[model samples]
Structure formats: structure tokens, C-alpha cells
Target: KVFERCELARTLKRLGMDGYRGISLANWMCLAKWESGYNTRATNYNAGDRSTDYGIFQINSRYWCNDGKTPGAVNAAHLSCSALLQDNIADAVAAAKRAVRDPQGIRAWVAWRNRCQNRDVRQYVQGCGV
Candidate 1:
């Protein structure tokens, strides 16, 4: 499903991610907006490294999901990288939650690291009525 921001927020909220590394529904929504523009098919290829970050969570091929074309891929999520790009989004969400539990926490998100950290994002949830 191609999700509007409001719809995405509601779905993410239903997932109950509050206190997962202190990231809230609003912050997760903002992360999705910046990472994938809310498009499930989004994939960011880092040409220099021959790596790709897949789907709304922007999970990386080098250490996470594996596309198989990338030889010797270490698939931390233990699923096909293409799974993350599916409309269903279940696998992507699962892998993203695992990433959140890592030592770096939500800082695994470049968007969170670069733009959202140490800032107020309650406005994101409010706009979604979440």
C-alpha cells in the first residue's frame, strides 16, 4: 500500500514503538518522511560503496537486509532485501525495530542523526492526529 503520511503515522502508532530507544510515534513518522518519502519501494544506493539502504526505514545492505546481487551480504534481518520494498511493509518494520535496539539506537537513521536529533518533533504527530 502506498501510504499517505497520516495513514503511515496511524500504522506506525499501532505498532506501539514508544520508548524504543526513546523514539516516539512522531519521530518515527518524521524518520519515514525523510528516509523514504513514505514510499515502500525507496532504495538508496551508495555508489561508492556498492551498498543500498532499502525501504521506508532506509536499512542498509552492508550490514542488514541483502539483495543477493551484492555478494557475501551480511543480512542481519535474515530476509531478502527486496522484502523491505514490498507494499505489505511487515518485514521492513520488523527489521527496523531490530536496528533500533542496536547500540546506536535510532541514530542508525541518517535522517535522525542529521536532522531530527535533539529537536522537538511533536508537531509531526499533531499533523497526523496520531
Candidate 2:
């Protein structure tokens, strides 16, 4: 988890924010814990497609590195390790920040998480320290 946090910090720097500008570290860390349990190599077998979704942010390969190279370039078998290893906490933080800052948007990271799942886990996560 510590290493995952470090990677997240680095990713945030790459995305032009140090420790997630305009967002609380507590909120970022909370989201990280909920998303991937701080596992950089985590993948969601529960995804609609069986392809691996990589990194601590759990970004589906089709969405993260989808620069029109391939349908799933980031999920390529040969580069699975590289894809899983790439840090994307910054990107996730930025997106969440945008959502939070939106006038008619959800302000809390936890709320966004609930929206992502379309299920309510706020109380559960709150007790879990996330």
C-alpha cells in the first residue's frame, strides 16, 4: 500500500498536480483504497470484458491508453506487465477533482465511487477508513 501511495504521488506529479491540487490527500487516499486496495497490479475480473484492467486506478485498458493504436493496446498480452505497472493516480485524481468542482456535480470522492458502482457503500467505507 505504501508503494502504491508513492506511485500515486508520482502519477499526480506527472499530471501537473503535487499531492492532488484542489483535492484533499485524505480524499485521494480514500479513493485509492476503495478502487484498488492500493494494488498496482490489480485487475477486475468482474469487468464486462475479460481483458485485464491495470494499475492502482483500475483503468480499463481500452480507455487508458486508447490512442487509436488498437482496441486494447494497453491490454495487450505482451505489455500486460507494463500496463499494470503504469501509475495513473494523477489522472484519476484530476477527473475526480473536475467532478467535484462541477457546479451540478457530486463533490465527494466517495459519492463518485458510489456512482461508479451504482450502489451505496459510503457507510461501509466510512467505517473502513475509506
Candidate 3:
């Protein structure tokens, strides 16, 4: 779903995800904006290798998502890649929280690492009351 940043923030806070996995809502929005501009159908392919990043969170096919065409794919989230592409992103958010519950934390998303990490992203949620 293509959602406004404020709507996303409000939903995240309602889902108790404002500080999920110790990652802030601002950082999540930053990552989502850069990853897919909050487009649920967004998909990116890597040319060097046949890999894909899917949906708003850009869940990777190599590990987190199963593309279904590949055999023996490791679906860490136990979900189909297509599932990430949906208007109701509750599942995507669940998967994202699952992803962040590791040593890498928000570093799981390179966008967060490069753009949000160590950065005060308070403005991302400005007026959202998150």
C-alpha cells in the first residue's frame, strides 16, 4: 500500500511498534521511504546475482522471502515474497520486526545503516505524535 508517512507512523504506534526492536519509527520511515517510497508492490532486482528486495521494507529473497520459483529457498520469515506486496502491511511490519530482532538490529536495512543510523530522525515523525 502507498501510505502517507504520518499514517504509517500512526499505525506503527498503534501496533506498539513506535520503538519496535529498539528501532525508532523515524528510522523505519526513513528506510521505507528510501526502500520503496512506501509502495507495496515495489521490487528491485540485483543484476550481479539473481536476488530481489521486495515491498516497502525491501525484504530480500536470498534469505527472508521465498520467490517461489527457486528451489530450497531459505524463507526466514516463512512467507512468500508476494505477501509483502499488499495494502495491509501488518504482515510486512511483523516481518520487519522479526528481521530486526537480531544482532544487526536496524542495520539489517542498509538504508537505516547509512541514512538513519546514528542520526536523529525525529523530523521524520514531525507532527505525527509518535
Highest TM-score against the true fold, candidate: 3
Give the whole-model CA lDDT for all candidates, comma-separated: 0.80, 0.46, 0.82
- Per-residue lDDT tens digits of candidate 1, residues 15-125? 766556677887887788888888899888887778898998888887778777675578677878888989987788888888887799888777887877788877667
Q: List the residue pairs that clash in candidate 3.
A: none
**Cα RMSD to the true fold for all candidates:** 1.6, 7.9, 1.6
TM-score per prediction, in order, is 0.90, 0.43, 0.91
Task: Flag clash pairs in model 2.
Answer: none
Model 2 lDDT per residue over 1-130, tens place: 3344545544544565433445444445445566677776666643555444445655445534332333445422223334454454444444444434445333333434564334443332243322
Ranking by lDDT: 3, 1, 2
Off by over 4 Å in 3: 70-72
Best by lDDT: 3
Model 2 poorest 10 in a row by lDDT: 121-130
Task: Give stretches of model 2 more than 4 Å off.
Answer: 1-21, 66-81, 86-112, 115-130
Q: Comparing candidate 2 with candidate 3, which one achieves the higher TM-score?
A: 3
